[PDB]
Structures are given as structure tokens and as C-alpha cells.
Amino acid sequence: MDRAAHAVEQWRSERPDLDPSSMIVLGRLQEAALVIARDRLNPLFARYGLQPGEFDVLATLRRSGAPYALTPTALYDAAMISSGSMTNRIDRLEKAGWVERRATLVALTSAGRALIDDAVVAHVDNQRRVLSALSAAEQRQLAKLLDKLLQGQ
Amino acid sequence: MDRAAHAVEQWRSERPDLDPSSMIVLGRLQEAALVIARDRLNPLFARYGLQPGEFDVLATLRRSGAPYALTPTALYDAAMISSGSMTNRIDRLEKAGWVERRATLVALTSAGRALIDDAVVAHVDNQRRVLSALSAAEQRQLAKLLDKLLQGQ
Ligand SMILES: O=c1[nH]c(=O)c2[nH]c(=O)[nH]c2[nH]1
Ligand SMILES: O=c1[nH]c(=O)c2[nH]c(=O)[nH]c2[nH]1
């Protein structure tokens, strides 16, 4: 038994007045997101010198198209993940020489564009290996269920 | 289109040499975990004065059974989520009067036991509403896929 099933098993024994069924899916959702981020995605970003969430900024700017420049608001709306601390991430990336601030726009530098062009290839290869245990149909069904859950929020 | 599908759509246009299919499921996994934690679960914990991750410590101690006392190692292995900073969470909970340190064991106080007995009821009710958009079968299928993905790590 994994953490979530063992936990639900203990609750049914200790608090039988409770219906702890919902704990499994949401506990596995949070643990999977945490373990994959911590042990799979972020070490790869770290090989490229990218902190948690800095990849998203570079990736969002790159896939917007030349000249790879977005307002900070467009940058937030087009981000893959709605995490916070966007001002401090742009600051960090500017000190590293990967973004600059034109006009208000945030723009990939040439070094930033090359970095993300390299990183995204290794990223998607890393992602497929993260999902290799799921079949193509299992991945698509998992993307459907996550969309339905996410729309419901 | 959600964030993940719009992002994949942009990549297929900007980097057609890439296969960005894996981005949807893992982007939706991370965004769903983040939005549910931020906008659904943690505000409820906050109503009870519980910081992110402090609920897990109390819940783990409670469902272990009387006298609700575990070693910090048993506490980590039985946690629902393998998040870090466990020493600083036990410190925080001890200053609040919800855990104490017997012998090395971490133990719910009476106030801590009552708090988690109250919180867990509101927690599971809150969780069902988080998952209300999914059918009982959709939730079970989502728990199966997340287990397969999590075992594969
Ligand atoms: O275009 C992106 N694809 C991802 O898979 C991803 N992940 C992330 O954190 N940011 C982005 N951006
Ligand atoms: O027994 C638990 N159930 C949960 O649903 C949960 N969530 C969390 O953070 N800790 C715990 N513990």
C-alpha cells in the first residue's frame, strides 16, 4: 500500500464515522506532483542553472514567438503553471542575463533564447521518461480527468 | 483551451522538431495540485490555524492510534505527503500547544487531538466538494492512473 491507501486504511479504523474515500485521489495527486517536481523535473532544470519556475518564464517567452517579448501580465496568463513570485523570478533571470526589460515588456536575451531552446529538448525527453509507465491511452485518459478536475475549480 | 493545451499548441508552431505531447498531462498534474492546494485545501487548514503541512503531522499522529505518539521517522513514513521541513513543523506545532515530545516520540496533546478530530471532518467534506465534478468512477480511475504514475517514479 502507498501512503494514501495506508492513510485511508488507518482512518477507517480510527474514525469510522468518517468517509475518507476522497483522500486517496487528492493525496496521490499532491504526492505525484511533489515527487515528480522534486526528483524528476527540477533537477533537470537545475542542470541548466534554472530555479523552480524560471523555466516556465523562459518557455513562455520562447513559445510566444519572435521577438519573444511579453508584458508581465501576458507572461502570467500564458504561463504553464500559475505560481507566484513572478517579479522575483524576472529579477533573478535578468541578473543571469537571460531576460531583459524593454517597453513594459519582458524579453528573452539571445543567451536566454539559446538556453531555453536547448533546455526544452531535454525537458520533453525527460518528461516522456517520467510518463513511460503509462500507456499512450493512459496518459490521454489522465489528461482528460485532470482537465475535468481542474475545470471544476 | 487551458494553460497546458495552449502551451502545447504554441510549441507545435514554434518548435515543430519537438514532440510536446507529454507537457499536457504533467502540466495539468502540477497546475491541479497547485490550484487545489492554494485555493481549496490550505484555506481550510488556515481556518484551523494550521500552516501548509502541519495538518499532515496532526492527521498522521491521530490515525496512528492512541496514545498518538510516533518517532519522527515513523512520522515521515506514515505522512500522506513526503514534504520536507519536518523539524520546523514539529517546532511550530509544539509552540502552538498541539504536539509534545516524549521518549524520542512526537505526541498529540489533548488540544492537538481535539483540533485534528474537528479539522479532519471539515477536511474530508471540503475534499468531496473539490472532487464533485468527477463521478465516483472517474475519481477511482483517476486514483488508479495516479498510482501507476507514482509507482513508476
Ligand atoms: O511550455 C512549457 N511547457 C512545460 O512543460 C512547462 N513546464 C513549466 O514549468 N513551464 C512550462 N512551459
Ligand atoms: O490522513 C491524512 N489525510 C489527508 O487527506 C491528508 N492531507 C494531508 O496533507 N495530510 C493528510 N493526512
Cell readout for B123 is: 477536511
User: What is the rounded CA–CA span in Å between residue A33 and residue B90?
Assistant: 24
Nearest-CB residue to B2 (from A59, A63, A150): A150
Query: Pick from A29, A60, A131: which is nearest to B33 by CB?
Result: A29
Our mutation pick for probing the ligand 2 site, out of A6, A11, A23, counting the most ligand atoms within 8 A of Cβ, is: A23
Measured between alpha carbons, how far is residue B141 from residues A41, A67, A150, B146 in Å?
A: 25, 43, 16, 9
Q: Quick one: which ligand is closest to A44's CA?
A: 1
Beta strands A69-70 and A105-108 are: antiparallel
Q: Cell 509507482 appears where? A: B151
* 8 A C-beta contact, residue A28 and residue A4: yes
d(CA B149, CA A12): 25
Peptide bond between residue A67 and the one before it cis (omega within 30 degrees of 0): yes
Q: What is the CA radius of gyration of chain B?
A: 19
Q: How far is CA B60 from CA A35, A94, B91, B126, in A?
A: 19, 43, 16, 18
Check CB contact of B74 with chain A, cutoff 8 Å.
no
CA-CA distance, B146 to A3, in Å (whole number)?
12
The Cα B7–Cα A145 span in angstroms is 19
The whole-angstrom separation of Cα A132 and Cα B25 is 12
In the numeric block, which cell numbers belong to residue A75? 507572461
| Contact criterion met (CB below 8 Å) for B23 and B8 | yes
SS3 A22: helix
Strand, coil or helix: B81: coil
Cα dihedral A19/A21/A23/A24 (nearest 10): 160
- Experimental determination technique: X-ray
